[model samples]
Target: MNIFEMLRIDEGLRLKIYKDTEGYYTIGIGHLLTKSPSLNAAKSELDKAIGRNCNGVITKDEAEKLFNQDVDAAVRGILRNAKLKPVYDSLDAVRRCALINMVFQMGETGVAGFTNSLRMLQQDRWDEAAVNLAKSRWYNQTPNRAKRVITTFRTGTWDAYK
Candidate 1:
């Protein structure tokens, strides 16, 4: 028998077709099922993730040439208008990048629910923010990432940030 194993199991298996925490219709190993993203960023939320049997998809050059401007516009819009704008503006570049990654993954409102964490961040209470960030469904769902974020917030460094 040709033994096979997943290269990365961090994301987990879905077992059946359903909407993900990010609300994308997904099945199996985090394969995104929607033909397109639905972001009413203000009203709804953030969205992302993936893998193969990913039949049709974009190439790097295609994404760069096809949607660079679209990505840029969103980057500016999300940073300025997101509730996490304070953290986005105040943190060092690496730390800032981690928060930005979160917004892209979960949306502005999703991360906003981490009220204590965000509040702590606003006050420059890094340790408190680190603690607050881990006490949530977000942390429950992504322990690995929570470890990284907690590290980033505490150290004011992106050393652990993905």
Candidate 2:
């Protein structure tokens, strides 16, 4: 049930994976399998990308690095700009990770556009989130990729991420 496992990564492998998979990268908003790198490498990269350091816990320094040392200020800004109090109130670690992944992939505005999905998740409406996730233009464009991430999100399994 660990989020990293859901994302199919061991740890500390994101940058390299991204570099290797650059050519195969598409403009879609889901996990895409390409012929570029080994599955292990890709998973490792993903783990690193989302890792709390290479370890399981995120240190303050690591958080600063990950969030570019603007954690408090950035959070305040998000709260002020997006009125994200409800989202913050509803987030669990896994959902937070999912949102971060979404933001990383599609910027703040793109992730914000998933208001329905976020609300559904806050209400513990998982099936609805899955459905809403699939309804996005991202889903329409990258069927296979969307399936992979959705599978992980629903089942806490990374076999599909491979």
Candidate 3:
């Protein structure tokens, strides 16, 4: 199946994915962590972590493919799991995709640990949300990635897929 088809993205979920991925692209979360020359291999590793297909290392074409996949999977999971829906509903696409990307890089619990960020997103405070994203322990731990994602989120642009 295509990435979006695999992930099951709908309109609401699509926005969430775009926002989150944009946030991640802003913060540079997925760059190195997800970077793999072999798309299938990278996806395989991500699948092991989150039980879904993903593009680990991606080109422009591959990135679009995997982005859709991740969004779809995230939306489907949130829809099926009532407990998660509340949390999922709190975020915009950027925030949601950021969370999903975080989960893909880390794990479910790891992504959930961003309690403060989640709260900020729920309130729709974009600047605070960006700051909160940079404040994470993950950000502290991965300075380069954090900077990259932050840049992407702030500018809504990033280098061509590599």
Who wins the TM-score comparison? 1
Better of 1 and 3 by TM-score: 1
lDDT of 3 by residue, 1-162 (tens): 232321222111221112233233211123222333454554465455444454333344444555555555655665565445566677555445444544545545555666776666666665776787887767787666566555434433333111
Candidate 1, residues 71-115: lDDT per residue as tens digits? 344357557765767666776665665565555446567777777
- Which parts of model 3 have CA positions greater than 4 angstroms off? 1-84, 151-162
Candidate 2 least-lDDT 10 residues: 25-34
lDDT for predicted candidate 3 compared with the true structure: 0.47
TM-scores across all candidates? 0.59, 0.48, 0.44
Top candidate on lDDT is 1
lDDT of 2 at 137: 83
Worst 10 residues of 3 by lDDT: 10-19
Candidate 2, residue 150: how far the Cα is off, in Å: 2.8
Score each candidate by Cα lDDT.
0.53, 0.50, 0.47
Worst ten-residue run, lDDT, model 1?
A: 1-10
- For candidate 3, the per-residue lDDT at 99 reads 47
